[PDB]
Amino acid sequence: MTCTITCWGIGVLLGIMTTVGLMVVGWSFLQGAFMGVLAWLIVGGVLAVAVC
Amino acid sequence: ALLSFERKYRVRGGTLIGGDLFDFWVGPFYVGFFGVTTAFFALLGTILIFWGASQQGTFNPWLINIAPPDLSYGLGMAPLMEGGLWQIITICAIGAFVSWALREVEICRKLGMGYHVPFAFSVAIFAYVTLVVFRPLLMGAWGHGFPYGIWSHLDWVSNTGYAYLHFHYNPAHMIAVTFFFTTTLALALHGALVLSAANPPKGEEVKGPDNEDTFFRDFIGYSIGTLGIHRVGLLLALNAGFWSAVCIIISGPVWTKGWPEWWNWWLEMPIWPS
Amino acid sequence: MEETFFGNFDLASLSLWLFYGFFALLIYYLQTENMREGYPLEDDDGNTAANQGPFPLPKEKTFKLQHGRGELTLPGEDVQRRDNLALRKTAHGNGFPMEPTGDPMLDGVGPASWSKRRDVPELDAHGHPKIVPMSAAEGFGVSAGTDPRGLPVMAGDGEIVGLVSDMWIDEAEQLVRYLEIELDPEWGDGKRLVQREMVRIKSDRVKVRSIYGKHFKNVPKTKSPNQVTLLEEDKIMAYYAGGTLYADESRLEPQL
Amino acid sequence: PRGTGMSVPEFVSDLDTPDPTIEVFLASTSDPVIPEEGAQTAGEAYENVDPVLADLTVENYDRLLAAMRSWTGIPDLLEDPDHYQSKVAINMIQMNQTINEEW
Amino acid sequence: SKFYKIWLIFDPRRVFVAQGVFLFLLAAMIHLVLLSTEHFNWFELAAANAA
Amino acid sequence: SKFYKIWLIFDPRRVFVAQGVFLFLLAAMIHLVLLSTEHFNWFELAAANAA
Amino acid sequence: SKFYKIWLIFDPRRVFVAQGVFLFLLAAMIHLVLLSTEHFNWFELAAANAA
Amino acid sequence: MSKFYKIWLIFDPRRVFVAQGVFLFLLAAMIHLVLLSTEHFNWFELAAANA
Amino acid sequence: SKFYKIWLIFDPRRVFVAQGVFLFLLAAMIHLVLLSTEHFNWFELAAANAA
Amino acid sequence: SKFYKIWLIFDPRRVFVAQGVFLFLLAAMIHLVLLSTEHFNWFELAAANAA
Amino acid sequence: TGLTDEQAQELHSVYMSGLWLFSAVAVVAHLATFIWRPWF
Amino acid sequence: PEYQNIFTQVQVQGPAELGVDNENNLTEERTTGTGFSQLIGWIGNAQLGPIYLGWFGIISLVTGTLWFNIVGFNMLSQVGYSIPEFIRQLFWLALEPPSPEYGLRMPPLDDGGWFIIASFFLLVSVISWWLRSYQLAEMHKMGKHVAWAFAAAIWLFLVLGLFRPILMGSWSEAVPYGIFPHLDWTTAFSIRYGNLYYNPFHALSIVFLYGSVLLFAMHGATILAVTRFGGDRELEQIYDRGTASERAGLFWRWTMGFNATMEGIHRWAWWFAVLTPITGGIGILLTGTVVDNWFLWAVEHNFAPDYTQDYGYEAYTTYDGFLGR
Numbered sequence A: 001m002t003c004t005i006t007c008w009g010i011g012v013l014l015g016i017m018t019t020v021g022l023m024v025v026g027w028s029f030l031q032g033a034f035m036g037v038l039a040w041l042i043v044g045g046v047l048a049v050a051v052c
Numbered sequence B: 001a002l003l004s005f006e007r008k009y010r011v012r013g014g015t016l017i018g019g020d021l022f023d024f025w026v027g028p029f030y031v032g033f034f035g036v037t038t039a040f041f042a043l044l045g046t047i048l049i050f051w052g053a054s055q056q057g058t059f060n061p062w063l064i065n066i067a068p069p070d071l072s073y074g075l076g077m078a079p080l081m082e083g084g085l086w087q088i089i090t091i092c093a094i095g096a097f098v099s100w101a102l103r104e105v106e107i108c109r110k111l112g113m114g115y116h117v118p119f120a121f122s123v124a125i126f127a128y129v130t131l132v133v134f135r136p137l138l139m140g141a142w143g144h145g146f147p148y149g150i151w152s153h154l155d156w157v158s159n160t161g162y163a164y165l166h167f168h169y170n171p172a173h174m175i176a177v178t179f180f181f182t183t184t185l186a187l188a189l190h191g192a193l194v195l196s197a198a199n200p201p202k203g204e205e206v207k208g209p210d211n212e213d214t215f216f217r218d219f220i221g222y223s224i225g226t227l228g229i230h231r232v233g234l235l236l237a238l239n240a241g242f243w244s245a246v247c248i249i250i251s252g253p254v255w256t257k258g259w260p261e262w263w264n265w266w267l268e269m270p271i272w273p274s
Numbered sequence C: 001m002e003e004t005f006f007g008n009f010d011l012a013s014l015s016l017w018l019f020y021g022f023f024a025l026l027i028y029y030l031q032t033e034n035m036r037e038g039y040p041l042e043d044d045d046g047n048t049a050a051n052q053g054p055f056p057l058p059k060e061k062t063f064k065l066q067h068g069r070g071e072l073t074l075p076g077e078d079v080q081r082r083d084n085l086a087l088r089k090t091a092h093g094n095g096f097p098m099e100p101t102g103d104p105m106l107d108g109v110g111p112a113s114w115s116k117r118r119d120v121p122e123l124d125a126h127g128h129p130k131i132v133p134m135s136a137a138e139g140f141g142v143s144a145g146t147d148p149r150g151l152p153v154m155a156g157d158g159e160i161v162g163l164v165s166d167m168w169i170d171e172a173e174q175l176v177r178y179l180e181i182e183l184d185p186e187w188g189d190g191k192r193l194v195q196r197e198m199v200r201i202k203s204d205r206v207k208v209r210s211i212y213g214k215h216f217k218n219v220p221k222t223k224s225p226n227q228v229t230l231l232e233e234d235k236i237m238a239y240y241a242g243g244t245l246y247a248d249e250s251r252l253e254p255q256l
Numbered sequence D: 001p002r003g004t005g006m007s008v009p010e011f012v013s014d015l016d017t018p019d020p021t022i023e024v025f026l027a028s029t030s031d032p033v034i035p036e037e038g039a040q041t042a043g044e045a046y047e048n049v050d051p052v053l054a055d056l057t058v059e060n061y062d063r064l065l066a067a068m069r070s071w072t073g074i075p076d077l078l079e080d081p082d083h084y085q086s087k088v089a090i091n092m093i094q095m096n097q098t099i100n101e102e103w
Numbered sequence E, F, G, I, J: 001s002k003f004y005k006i007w008l009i010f011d012p013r014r015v016f017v018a019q020g021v022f023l024f025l026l027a028a029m030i031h032l033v034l035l036s037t038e039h040f041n042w043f044e045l046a047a048a049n050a051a
Numbered sequence H: 001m002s003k004f005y006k007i008w009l010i011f012d013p014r015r016v017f018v019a020q021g022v023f024l025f026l027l028a029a030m031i032h033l034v035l036l037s038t039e040h041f042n043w044f045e046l047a048a049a050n051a
Numbered sequence K: 001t002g003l004t005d006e007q008a009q010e011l012h013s014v015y016m017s018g019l020w021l022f023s024a025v026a027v028v029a030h031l032a033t034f035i036w037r038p039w040f
Numbered sequence L: 001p002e003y004q005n006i007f008t009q010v011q012v013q014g015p016a017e018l019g020v021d022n023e024n025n026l027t028e029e030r031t032t033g034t035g036f037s038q039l040i041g042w043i044g045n046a047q048l049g050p051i052y053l054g055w056f057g058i059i060s061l062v063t064g065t066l067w068f069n070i071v072g073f074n075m076l077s078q079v080g081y082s083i084p085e086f087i088r089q090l091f092w093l094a095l096e097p098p099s100p101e102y103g104l105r106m107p108p109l110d111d112g113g114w115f116i117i118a119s120f121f122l123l124v125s126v127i128s129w130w131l132r133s134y135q136l137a138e139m140h141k142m143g144k145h146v147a148w149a150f151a152a153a154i155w156l157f158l159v160l161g162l163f164r165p166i167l168m169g170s171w172s173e174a175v176p177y178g179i180f181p182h183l184d185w186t187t188a189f190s191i192r193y194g195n196l197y198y199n200p201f202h203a204l205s206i207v208f209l210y211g212s213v214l215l216f217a218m219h220g221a222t223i224l225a226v227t228r229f230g231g232d233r234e235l236e237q238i239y240d241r242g243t244a245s246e247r248a249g250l251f252w253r254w255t256m257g258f259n260a261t262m263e264g265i266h267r268w269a270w271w272f273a274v275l276t277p278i279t280g281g282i283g284i285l286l287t288g289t290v291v292d293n294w295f296l297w298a299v300e301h302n303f304a305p306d307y308t309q310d311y312g313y314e315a316y317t318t319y320d321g322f323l324g325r
């Protein structure tokens, strides 16, 4: 691997960014975290599949 | 007594502490340094329960109830007949459970096998620990632990569950319950394959791993394999124990309102039109 | 119905007692089904013990083994018993550990003890041997993870004993079972098998911690380089797991 | 009883925060003025006052009427008797007296 | 100056896929930040501008 | 210019599938933010007209 | 133009199935959107016309 | 138009016919159920009203 | 002056990917924490300035 | 102070990465705890200074 | 798999050189911070 | 540390295994379309092999989809075909059972009529799937343990929605088709009939539910502990006992005084899981038909605990004291 795990790491890092980014513009932690979790699975999953 | 094959496995060594001072067998049981402590703590806790039952006035196993102290006593010690006996038994219970897990380490070390069993038991201990000491510490009183009674500790579950107005809406309860109903489903199906393959209809040859492997491929379109089922079966059970610890440690230390009110984040998202 | 038969014994109470009787019979049935192997009990000296337990032995059941291997009635004499065990009692009574009389790893006692299984390879549904090297297997290849073929093997004390030459797979289940080790001349002579559960694969090496460098020359060998029998599998695996306690005195002696 | 699980959890930060409207009421209430013998009633001091509160003393009437305007957030309450808010307020005055006495 | 040597370290396909994903996601959220504000929301401005 | 060389890196069948999925999802997302607003929602706008 | 070359890249069997489910799902979604609006709900409009 | 018969070269008649039958019936039940939900097109409720 | 030995230790591919990810996240979080303030918020600054 | 013998027992790859991560975390922690205080928060300091 | 005496001479020379360079900025930053806003 | 067999360190993939076959001709109903997933292969088998489709499988899938659609499309109609509202309230919507006033008669479509029709298709789909399990075992010449275990689950499924409503004489006793609503039914069911904690069969079913998770954690870890001796090949250990079965047995014998065999463990495993809904099915059947109040039943049978402390909060603290003022 060493690339699928790395791409997964970018996804979880983006989810943390998405959570705090949405909290800055309002929203709430749980509302922001849900989109952060959702962004982790989609973007992280796509990156691991689009490029290996 | 021994078994037909037990003699060649009873070799000296493998202890974590105490060496050959305690390294012997009493009947079928293995006694170690932690087998001595297990015997002491379990017997002390058992006797104290019946001592408390004697002072409670009843020896009926359904009606025996040793209860924690009041919330006023805080994290300090309480009088023995006013909730202090429960605290002593908890120390004995924790000491007996930890010793039991450490005794399992010595046994599996003497047999040259893995430490999966003691590790899995630790999750069960962690669920017990988070119910009796971890959660009361966060909530600031020893009276938040469940009482030591066969039917009394169901009343604690009933009131703790209804202390949040609907305990089915707990997101961690939702996840944790899903793991029991699935682990039992996995246990039923896994135990059926081995039984079905090893016990075919009378007059038929027994089936090998290939036959059971292709059964679920024919049945649900995918088979996890002989190794995978145990590997995923432990994970389902361990996750069940872990998530059950989560659902009760966030009820009161992290969340004080009703559990249906938690889902208000989903209902009132900005994306949803008004 | 809301009417009680006598006192306060209603239909719900009756069903509870029926389950109690059924459960007692179920526990009796379940426990006796677990006594098909290992009984009678015997004692430390080998003679049958005076105590045999509250549960009598079950009636004989027959397994119709496939591939023309005959029948098998589990309650009876066990063909997996080992003889001439290199052990001696440490006490004149019962309930005390046995001490090996020689090299425990070589003699196969305790954690290194094997069982006298059949001296034939395990077979798949077709009848061919279940475990074969990937050299013989057609169309099989590594699809994920780290390929261990060619990596050096590092023993439990850090010694390099050789490089992985081949790797045996279970083509029926597409699962890796063993790794072949090409022992160096300074450590061994030929090839040895290590089960996949006692090897940790790294990016540049494979590490086996249960066996030191000097213990590799005594790993049991296979009669043929194309298949491994059930007895050979049981001897090879037991040797590695026996090194988790017999590699050096520090492992045998208490850690505290 | 101890061990039954019968307890109510609450955050200490939430406990230390009282009702924000408590200080609002304290800033709006006032001590009652005890009437003296033959005091001037609101019915004769003013005009178009409902009999439910026309017997109040003139300072008590002014004290109560000013508070009700602040309590209900209606700066012109009980000014025009024909207004619907005035008629509702008069009935709802009888509501409040009933609650404190019957219930 | 001789930045062209970066392609001797990074696989051109490995970076092009990541660069495409990064640029769109950056452009997507940078547009969404403006919509959150009440001054740069062009959808909200047109409603207010038309009165 | 020389942009045609991108196909020496990208697989045409593997990128056309991604482009087709991306384009529709982008189109649906923009069509959905318009309906979220009260100014560009042509469904609610038509209801206001002739009413 | 010369768009026919798309079939040298796309497999006709796999594409035809893909758009067969896409076209109907898109059509069903749009038909459902109208049913959620008071102005374009033809089922509820007929009831009002009768009364 | 006249040369659509080539679709049976791409598609296997066996699996197309089975899929078409399931889709056609599941379609027919959908509209019939939709009509029964409305207060105006429920032929069972209308007959009771005329009684 | 002797710092160029640093490339004899770490692989340029591994460090460059890690550096690029860290550089963006650091820049992103500095911008975000800057927006959370009521003084260095150029989006809210324009709204106040316009009014 | 030569102390070069220390590097004989240490892997340069592991120690350099270990301290680099730790050094950044220590600096980030000090900056963060410095922001928490109402006197050393230079973000709030500018806001009060401007007013 | 281990280092020689010669390698540690160069490795420590760089590390100590970088350490002084990093600390040279840090002491300047702390000096400027104290003037701007002392903490003593 | 030692390699714990939780993730495979290397995967080998060869030609797809189409499965064994006999004179029953299993291959003519098989899809023969296989795919390999490496992500799932880290923990289990990596092949998504062909599925046997017969008639019980097809009938169950078609009828199951009809139940799914009827329940689902009713929910969409409930929010006025608003997809954004359908997604938002997805966990809250349901298809409520008929009102109690209609008894066992057929209720109107908007008041539980579609519930009965949808429940009819779900009953067909579940029973058809059971027949497929029974038929597949017979065609494979294997034991019918899968069908018998699944029949135990259906017993609670039948009691909860079919048998008990008939005994009470009202279709209103069924379970609503909703995510949160069938949790609301579960809580309301316990409250209406006393306290379901005091149902002896509910207590007994919990014993076998906890035992099921207990035993599968014990069995899952034990096999992973002996997988270094080829312990994952359980079937071959039954026919020819190796050192894996001996150590696994001796570990539990030295721990708790008795053990099992490689076959007998799966008899314990089968029976605890099967007894979980069998006992619960009896408890639900007796609830409402016989008892109607479980705590009062417990008081009558003298296993309800009694408490002597006071109940109000004024007996333990004060309102000012709790508020810290």
Ligand code: BCL
Pocket: B097, B124, B125, B127, B128, B131, B156, B157, B158, B159, B160, B161, B162, B167, B168, B173, B176, B177, B180, B240, B241, B243, B244, B245, B247, B248, L186, L187
């Ligand atoms: C009104 C009641 C509320 C409710 C309120 C609660 C409350 C309150 C709790 C749960 C908790 C649980 N609930 Mg709930 N819950 C409700 C409805 C349900 C339903 C259902 C179908 O309706 C289900 C399946 C569950 C399921 C569960 C699991 C999530 C969990 C069970 C305990 C646990 O995991 O064990 C873990 C516990 C252990 C493994 C104990 C370890 C035992 C030790 C190690 C062994 C000691 C041996 C002993 C000494 C005997 C040995 C001697 C003998 C000789 C052998 N709840 C209702 C709605 N639920 C409980 C939980 O999560 O606890 C963490 C919890 O506190």
Ligand code: BCL
Pocket: B157, B181, B184, L126, L153, L154, L156, L157, L160, L186, L187, L188, L189, L190, L195, L196, L197, L201, L202, L205, L206, L207, L209, L276, L277, L279, L280, L281, L282, L283, L284
């Ligand atoms: C306030 C809540 C009440 C409560 C009310 C109930 C009620 C009500 C019931 C239980 C029952 C159960 N309770 Mg209780 N229970 C409570 C407290 C608890 C606690 C706890 C820690 O507090 C626990 C652990 C439990 C545990 C349990 C289990 C022992 C038992 C469920 C059996 C089972 O496995 O179902 C598994 C069985 C099913 C899920 C049916 C299977 C359906 C068929 C086979 C599958 C159809 C599949 C379907 C078509 C979908 C397929 C789709 C696929 C995608 C293709 N209860 C409190 C007191 N409890 C049950 C019982 O009584 O048993 C006697 C029950 O009915």
Ligand SMILES: CC[C@H]1c2cc3[nH]c4c(c3C)C(=O)[C@H](C(=O)OC)c4c3nc(cc4[nH]c(cc(n2)[C@@H]1C)c(C(C)=O)c4C)[C@@H](C)[C@@H]3CCC(=O)OC/C=C(\C)CCC[C@H](C)CCC[C@H](C)CCCC(C)C
Pocket: B038, B041, B042, B043, B044, B045, B046, B089, B092, B093, B096, B097, B100, B117, B118, B120, B121, B123, B124, B147, B148, B149, B150, B151, B153, B237, B238, B240, B241, L210, L211, L213, L214, L217, L218, L221, L255, L256
């Ligand atoms: C992964 C989580 C699951 C799990 C796993 C698990 N449990 C385990 C193991 C594993 C892997 C073991 O290896 C170990 C074992 O050896 O079992 C046979 C065990 C075990 N888990 C057990 C029970 C148990 N497991 C439960 C559940 C679970 N454990 C989970 C479902 C439950 C529940 C929730 O109902 C119970 C009751 C035992 C059979 C055994 C541990 C035996 C032990 O600790 O022995 C030492 C102690 C004594 C002999 C007596 C101690 C007495 C005390 C000193 C006094 C009383 C204290 C107690 C609080 C009393 C409370 C009574 C009231 C609540 C009624």
Ligand SMILES: CC[C@H]1c2cc3[nH]c4c(c3C)C(=O)[C@H](C(=O)OC)c4c3nc(cc4[nH]c(cc(n2)[C@@H]1C)c(C(C)=O)c4C)[C@@H](C)[C@@H]3CCC(=O)OC/C=C(\C)CCC[C@H](C)CCC[C@H](C)CCCC(C)C
Pocket: B180, B181, B182, B183, B184, B185, B186, B188, B189, B220, L060, L061, L064, L065, L068, L125, L126, L129, L133, L146, L149, L150, L152, L153, L273, L274, L276, L277
């Ligand atoms: C009692 C002990 C455990 C247990 C046992 C148990 N369950 C079992 C079995 C056993 C032994 C089986 O053999 C059997 C099985 O097949 O297992 C794989 C099963 C089973 N129990 C299941 C689940 C299940 N088990 C549960 C619980 C349990 N049962 C316990 C954990 C529960 C709960 C919590 O109540 C459930 C929900 C199923 C997965 C399975 C058999 C159900 C089944 O397949 O029924 C036939 C139905 C269908 C094929 C279709 C159902 C509906 C679909 C969702 C429709 C399709 C939708 C799709 C998106 C199409 C959309 C089309 C439109 C867009 C047009």
Ligand SMILES: COC1=C(OC)C(=O)C(C/C=C(/C)CC/C=C(\C)CC/C=C(/C)CC/C=C(\C)CC/C=C(/C)CC/C=C(\C)CC/C=C(\C)CC/C=C(\C)CC/C=C(\C)CCC=C(C)C)=C(C)C1=O
Pocket: B026, B027, B029, B030, B031, B035, B036, B038, B039, L211, L214, L215, L218, L219, L220, L222, L223, L245, L248, L249, L250, L252, L255, L256, L257, L258, L259, L260, L261, L262, L265, L268, L269
């Ligand atoms: C395939 O692989 C596998 C097997 O098969 C090879 C297996 O089998 C198993 C095991 C699992 C099974 C299901 C098989 C059979 C087992 C069960 C049915 C139990 C599992 C099911 C449950 C629901 C769990 C409940 C457990 C039960 C009923 C068993 C009892 C458990 C106990 C913890 C009680 C026993 C403990 C005792 C008695 C205390 C221990 C005693 C000591 C340490 C001795 C102390 C002594 C001294 C200090 C010396 C001084 C001497 C004294 C005091 C004299 C006193 C002596 C006495 C003897 C009393 C698994 C998992 C497996 O995967």
Ligand SMILES: CCCCCCCC/C=C/CCCCCCCC(=O)O[C@H](COC(=O)CCCCCCCCCCCCCCCCC)COP(=O)(O)OC[C@@H](O)CO
Pocket: B017, B037, B091, B094, B095, B098, B099, C255, C256
């Ligand atoms: C609720 C209870 C839960 C616990 C239940 C289980 C109970 C206990 C497990 C205790 C394990 C302690 C292990 C420490 C042993 C280290 C001994 C060792 O290893 O070093 C020995 C030297 O001896 C010693 O050092 C003496 C032991 C020191 C005592 C320390 C007490 C720790 C006490 C720890 C307890 C802490 C809890 C704090 C609570 C209260 C919190 C207030 C040399 O080696 P040798 O063996 O002599 O040489 C062999 C020769 O023949 C040939 O070489």
Ligand SMILES: COC(C)(C)C(=O)/C=C/C(C)=C/C=C/C(C)=C/C=C/C(C)=C/C=C/C=C(C)/C=C/C=C(\C)CC/C=C(\C)CCC=C(C)C
Pocket: I002, I003, I005, I006, I008, I009, J016, J019, J023, J026, J029, J030, J033, K007, K010, K011, K013, K014, K015, K016, K017, K018, K019, K022
């Ligand atoms: C509230 O809590 C508060 C109060 C805040 C708190 O916690 C107080 C903080 C506390 C108590 C922590 C005390 C901090 C301490 C003790 C940290 C010492 C700081 C140190 C040690 C600085 C290292 C700098 C290392 C570099 C930057 C080197 C530069 C060299 C680099 C790496 C290049 C080297 C590489 C080469 C030359 C190439 C290789 C060469 C060849 C291969 C030849």
Ligand SMILES: COC(C)(C)C(=O)/C=C/C(C)=C/C=C/C(C)=C/C=C/C(C)=C/C=C\C=C(C)\C=C\C=C(\C)CC/C=C(/C)CCC=C(C)C
Pocket: L068, L069, L071, L072, L073, L075, L076, L116, L119, L120, L122, L123, L157, L158, L160, L161, L162, L174, L175, L176, L177, L178, L179, L182
């Ligand atoms: C996008 O796709 C479309 C399609 C548009 C869509 O909408 C998607 C569908 C969506 C989202 C629906 C989501 C479904 C949900 C949430 C349903 C959850 C279901 C749950 C929790 C089940 C509760 C337990 C049920 C029991 C326990 C039954 C027991 C009753 C059985 C069946 C016995 C038989 C009963 C009878 C009455 C017999 C009648 C027979 C005769 C009268 C002969």
Ligand SMILES: COC(C)(C)C(=O)/C=C/C(C)=C/C=C/C(C)=C/C=C/C(C)=C\C=C/C=C(C)/C=C/C=C(\C)CC/C=C(\C)CCC=C(C)C
Pocket: J016, J017, J019, J020, K022, K025, K026, K028, K029, K030, K032, K033, K035, K036
């Ligand atoms: C009218 O009033 C007036 C007069 C205006 C007034 O108020 C006076 C104003 C005054 C006094 C200004 C107050 C100044 C302040 C507060 C200055 C803070 C700033 C400080 C102190 C430092 C900044 C520069 C830091 C860098 C730029 C470091 C460079 C670090 C680099 C990036 C190296 C890091 C990387 C590595 C080491 C890699 C190692 C690698 C491995 C280990 C692998």
Ligand SMILES: [Fe+3]
Pocket: B190, B194, B230, L219, L223, L234, L266
């Ligand atoms: Fe098994």
